[PDB]
Amino acid sequence: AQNPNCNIMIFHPTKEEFNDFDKYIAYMESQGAHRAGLAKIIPPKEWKARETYDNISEILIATPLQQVASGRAGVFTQYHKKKKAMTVGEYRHLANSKKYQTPPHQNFEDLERKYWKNRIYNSPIYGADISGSLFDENTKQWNLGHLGTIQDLLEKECGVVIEGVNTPYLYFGMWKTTFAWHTEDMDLYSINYLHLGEPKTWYVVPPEHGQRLERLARELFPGSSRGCGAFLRHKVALISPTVLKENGIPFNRITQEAGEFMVTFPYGYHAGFNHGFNCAEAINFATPRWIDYGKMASQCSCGEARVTFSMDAFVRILQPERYDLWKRGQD
Numbered sequence: 001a002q003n004p005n006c007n008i009m010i011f012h013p014t015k016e017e018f019n020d021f022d023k024y025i026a027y028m029e030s031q032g033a034h035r036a037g038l039a040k041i042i043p044p045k046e047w048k049a050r051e052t053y054d055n056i057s058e059i060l061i062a063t064p065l066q067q068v069a070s071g072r073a074g075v076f077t078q079y080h081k082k083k084k085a086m087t088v089g090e091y092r093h094l095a096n097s098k099k100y101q102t103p104p105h106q107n108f109e110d111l112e113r114k115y116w117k118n119r120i121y122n123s124p125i126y127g128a129d130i131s132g133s134l135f136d137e138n139t140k141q142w143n144l145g146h147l148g149t150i151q152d153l154l155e156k157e158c159g160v161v162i163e164g165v166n167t168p169y170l171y172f173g174m175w176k177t178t179f180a181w182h183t184e185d186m187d188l189y190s191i192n193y194l195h196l197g198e199p200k201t202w203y204v205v206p207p208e209h210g211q212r213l214e215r216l217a218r219e220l221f222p223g224s225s226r227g228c229g230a231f232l233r234h235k236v237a238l239i240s241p242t243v244l245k246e247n248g249i250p251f252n253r254i255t256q257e258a259g260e261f262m263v264t265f266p267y268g269y270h271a272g273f274n275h276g277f278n279c280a281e282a283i284n285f286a287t288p289r290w291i292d293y294g295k296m297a298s299q300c301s302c303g304e305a306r307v308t309f310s311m312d313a314f315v316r317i318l319q320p321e322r323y324d325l326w327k328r329g330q331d
């Protein structure tokens with residue numbers, strides 16, 4: 001069995017290997033990359049996502065989210081307070097202000113220590129989940145706006161044509177902006193490209209050990225657990241690496257820098273934080289190996305998780321017994 005310790009693998013494809021996205025994902029899996037839940041892909045040196053980032057300041061962040069924390073430094077929840085719209089240029093200035101800017105630090109490990117010690121005492125503002133793309137239309141390789149759609153994968157694998165679309169989303173981050181512990185909708189893959197700016201630190205639990213994380217989370221968030229049998233679908237809970245280590249949960253960590261892709265694999269729980277002003281782009285995708293994970297994915301039916309239009313068909317076709325109850329949560 002390849003990669004039996006479930007380490008995060010880093011890949012350096014040549015320009016020739018960067019032509020066929022599906023084929024390269026399958027190659028990474030042949031080497032055991034999926035066992036970690038997360039892989040890093042460094043694009044060939046010839047490749048670029050677009051020519052410059054000099055003209056992005058007029059993108060609108062219609063609903064910036066202030067991420068307010070409750071709990072203790074290593075075990076907390078966050079809620080998202082909606083703020084007034086602002087442009088990317090306004091947001092960048094805000095991120096760089098004395099109130100929100102990255103502190104002085106020695107290296108990524110020192111910054112990680114400062115994040116875990118101090119995150120809860122601040123409420124950073126995240127421009128998340130903005131439909132759109134920063135890939136140039138002429139970028140032919142690994143262009144996250146030109147991937148094969150999950151609807152077409154389901155149709156190719158299973159023969160059933162379904163409604164729905166699959167488009168990318170932009171994330172504009174600042175110091176301490178946080179992504180809570182989660183898997184993807186329907187336990188899909190994700191791919192994330194860090195277009196510009198400061199790094200993003202990721203934490204991930206191997207898919208084969210995801211239920212260990214879920215059991216800890218039920219212990220650490222006991223009211224939330226009673227409220228919903230899949231409350232990590234709410235994307236609000238944080239647990240630090242120190243706490244994970246104290247409770248014996250297998251995980252790994254890695255820092256993504258600008259110009260790098262990360263791939264999350266089906267049922268790979270992940271969480272993380274941004275080091276400073278940055279912009280990422282991400283989208284879900286599927287392969288034939290995902291289908292069995294989609295069929296088994298948990299679902300939130302309490303009403304909190306509220307998701308996209310396109311998840312309807314996935315539930316309806318892959319999970320017909322759950323469909324009725326899940327849809328009641330959606331309506």
Ligand SMILES: O=C(O)CNC(=O)C(=O)O
Nearest residue numbers: 171179190191192280282
């Ligand atoms: O970058 C972020 O804030 C969160 N992104 C992801 O969870 C992803 O790409 O799957």
Ligand SMILES: [Mg+2]
Nearest residue numbers: 056057058059
């Ligand atoms: Mg612009």
Ligand code: NI
Nearest residue numbers: 183184190264
């Ligand atoms: Ni994710």
Ligand SMILES: [Zn+2]
Nearest residue numbers: 228300302304
């Ligand atoms: Zn729920």
